[model samples]
Target: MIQRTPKIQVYSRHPAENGKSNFLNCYVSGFHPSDIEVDLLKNGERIEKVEHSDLSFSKDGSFWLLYYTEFTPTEKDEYACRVNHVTLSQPKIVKWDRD
Candidate 1:
């Protein structure tokens, strides 16, 4: 299966807002994979699931799909995406705004 990272971007919060949020998307596939799960953590506390679902695989055991969304941050936070509990992408963090 193929393993790759999709495009990603970060945006700062506006003056009228409290904090910032992030939107991310990843594409991955490997070893007869068939599902993807999105996990998000804020200050080490697990946040309730934002989304999850089952997916199909390619004939060659590789697949391509998207995991995209906008999550508002109350504080510093990290995010991750997993495939079949065997493969995990690096976790990224959003710093807290001090202004």
Candidate 2:
């Protein structure tokens, strides 16, 4: 079976738990082949101690899947989401930008 590579979009939201903290959400969608992998990273290293959720699908039941990871940011750290799938020649990576 042929596979499709996912297009990734990411953004950060500041939830009001405290004024000094934020969560970076990486949205990975529009792909095929259910075995895709997603990871949250800090400073180019994969962080295993964060929160991750299961794959979500569109209500219309398409080949796309919605998956996200939450990461707490510090004042001086780079955060990103790295994705791996058979459809991609190499892993697709997207970085979070502070607003």
Candidate 3:
């Protein structure tokens, strides 16, 4: 059987590519059976819109699927990513805390 659970990771940069701004990134990978969904959240709420230009994905040539999204951040806000797959009874969630 294919593995259907996703491994979720949250990442960020305080001084992102511009070196003067903050951004958040979420990586959702390794889920199987391909029908997976990911949500990017700020302080527990879902972000309503994102540009297709800011989201991208890649694959491992088999069984593994990966997705990533980037977002500008609000100072001191909490951010997280949640993954939904058939293997998970509850969503897989990961958080990024700017320390």
Candidate 4:
């Protein structure tokens, strides 16, 4: 059986390298509540054009979602995903480490 505990993953659609275009992505899963806030950050601030996906449910009825943006990864810049949810003790934040 699959664990239904809350979790998050920050990643890219492709293998990221310095000075190329890629899709920056964040996936959060196993939360039942619909009240979730997401923020996509680059260099520690919010940015625009972050697209979110429709909810998908697991067998246990927990929900999963994704938020993504077109981004360029290079040296000295940071990318991150932030979420606010009732399932979390505090706001959850995850970083997109350059691959």
Candidate 5:
């Protein structure tokens, strides 16, 4: 029998490309083949809602998804990823920080 797993959320950090942090692609998975709705936030502001690909879920409604966001974040820039109209993951600091 096929087992349906619970929803999942993941994230990664990378240096801003060309000193610009506005255009990037997000990698999402584990959903329908269609694109999923998502909002990317930068510096505590809703920079923009990723448009172009619609949100999609997979069959059995369980798996990992990937998206590519082409935004070049500034040093210490905060980034976040959300799914299912909910905040699935927390904001990650993209800048190099020593703590």
Candidate 6:
């Protein structure tokens, strides 16, 4: 199988306001093969109760998924998304920008 690197995106499902509850999302797509790992982090540590979709593929054979978890945005915490796949030499990473 040919190697295809995954693209990653990190964002909140709703407008992030400090103290309000929202969904943090990590959308990874366009990667080949079925094996992959996704981690959601808050303050550089793994966040618990993370939820993700089943491995699904596009017509071109690249796979995609949405990994997410509930979070309450705050001034003290930073959030990030990280992905590991067989085709990459290093883990793909993306950070949530609270704007």
Residue 18 deviation, candidate 6, in Å?
A: 1.4
Give the per-residue lDDT of model 2 (tens digit) for 1-99. Answer: 646677787677664232355566767776766677887788999878656554665553424533444555666788788999888889888887755
The order by descending TM-score is: 6, 4, 2, 3, 5, 1
lDDT of all the models against the reference? 0.42, 0.68, 0.62, 0.78, 0.45, 0.84
lDDT of 4 by residue, 50-78 (tens): 86575688777778888787787887888
lDDT tens readout by residue for model 6, 1-99? 677888888988998988888999888989877688889988888877886565588999888998887788888889998788998788876889967
Q: What TM-score fits each model? A: 0.39, 0.75, 0.68, 0.82, 0.42, 0.90
Worst 10 residues of 6 by lDDT: 46-55
lDDT per residue, candidate 1, 1-99, as tens digits? 554332222233243232555444434334334444434444556456545323456576565454445566454354444333334355443322334
Query: lDDT of candidate 1?
Result: 0.42
Which pairs, if any, clash in model 3? none
Model 2, which residues run further than 4 Å from truth?
15-19, 59-72
User: Which residue runs does candidate 5 get wrong by more than 4 Å?
Assistant: 1-23, 32-37, 49-68, 85-99
Off by over 4 Å in 4: 1-5
Better candidate number, 1 or 5, judged by TM-score: 5
Which regions of candidate 3 deviate over 4 angstroms? 13-20, 52-70
Tens digits of per-residue lDDT, candidate 5, 1-99, equal: 333322434243443454754444444554442333544556556556444443444555644444445556566677654444223244332322212
lDDT for model 5? 0.45
Residue-wise C-alpha lDDT for candidate 3, range 1-99, written one tens digit per residue: 656466776776454443345556665666566677777787899876643223333455224433344565655567788878888888877887655
